[PDB]
Amino acid sequence: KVTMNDFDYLKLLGKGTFGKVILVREKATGRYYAMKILRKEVIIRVLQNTRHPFLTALKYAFQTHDRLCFVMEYANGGELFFHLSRERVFTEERARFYGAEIVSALEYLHSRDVVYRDIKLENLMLDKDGHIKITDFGLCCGTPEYLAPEVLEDNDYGRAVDWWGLGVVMYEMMCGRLPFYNQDHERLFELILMEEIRFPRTLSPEAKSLLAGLLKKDPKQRLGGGPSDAKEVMEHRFFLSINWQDVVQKKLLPPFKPQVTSEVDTRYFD
């Protein structure tokens, strides 16, 4: 049985309002993980069985006296946000790559009736090979939150929000900025609900089409909002050059290589 004594503490990753996430190293294998620690009283499974190439795998689950613990695989490449910062913007192809691996992960979750709710830049990390890895920690606080219109209006967390999350993630990936950066976050609520989102002229016709689809205010009209879920997204023009069987297989070549020697290389951890 796993316990607190099988790990060496290294650093905090995301903080408590619901618990903590800390970077640790399993003493026996020397491998690294992110330990989620949930306050049992501050809280006054699906996730654990959902395995997928671009989804962070749960390694261990144990309980302490008044704490819930989830030891999870920690990607070695840095957090996408870090990489996006350096490049400022990704090539539509670089974005298409990542956007493709997310769509794959989302089609899988939706197939299992699971709505992810947290598709967003900060939840994206790159693994040792440069393949995307979606996480459930909480890096960065004051980063403008971009909840789906149907969330802000009806607190509806249908599967459509994941496509919206994808849209906001793709937009910032190809536009180098959030849809409404030019405006203070105070009016962000009315904006998301009633403001048409503008796109850079440099944006390819296909890419403008994707985003406008992923970012429609009406869930039912949104790209991926129709009954065939991910099909609509997978078969959109922007993804013509995509071999879906190739992506889930990790046959595709990462547009960028992290620079880590192996999942033990404490580089990106800092």
UniProtKB/Swiss-Prot annotation:
Summarize what the UniProt record says about post-translational modification: Phosphorylated and activated by PDPK1/PDK1 in the presence of phosphatidylinositol 3,4,5-trisphosphate. Ubiquitinated; undergoes both 'Lys-48'- and 'Lys-63'-linked polyubiquitination. TRAF6 catalyzes 'Lys-63'-linked AKT2 ubiquitination; this modification may be important for AKT2 recruitment to the plasma membrane and for AKT2 activating phosphorylation. When phosphorylated, undergoes 'Lys-48'-polyubiquitination catalyzed by TTC3 in the nucleus, leading to its degradation by the proteasome.
State the disulfide connectivity: C140-C141
Gene Ontology cellular component annotations, sorted alphabetically:
cell cortex; cytoplasm; cytosol; early endosome; intracellular membrane-bounded organelle; nucleoplasm; nucleus; plasma membrane
Which residues belong to any copy of the Protein kinase domain?
7-239
**Subunit structure and binding partners:** Interacts with BTBD10. Interacts with KCTD20. Interacts (via PH domain) with MTCP1, TCL1A and TCL1B; this interaction may facilitate AKT2 oligomerization and phosphorylation, hence increasing kinase activity. Interacts with PHB2; this interaction may be important for myogenic differentiation. Interacts (when phosphorylated) with CLIP3/ClipR-59; this interaction promotes AKT2 recruitment to the plasma membrane. Interacts with WDFY2/ProF (via WD repeats 1-3).
Related disease?
Defects in AKT2 are a cause of susceptibility to breast cancer (BC). AKT2 promotes metastasis of tumor cells without affecting the latency of tumor development. May play a role in glioblastoma cell survival.
Q: What is this protein called?
A: RAC-beta serine/threonine-protein kinase
Species in which this protein is naturally found: Homo sapiens
Part of the whole protein covered: 146 to 440 of 481
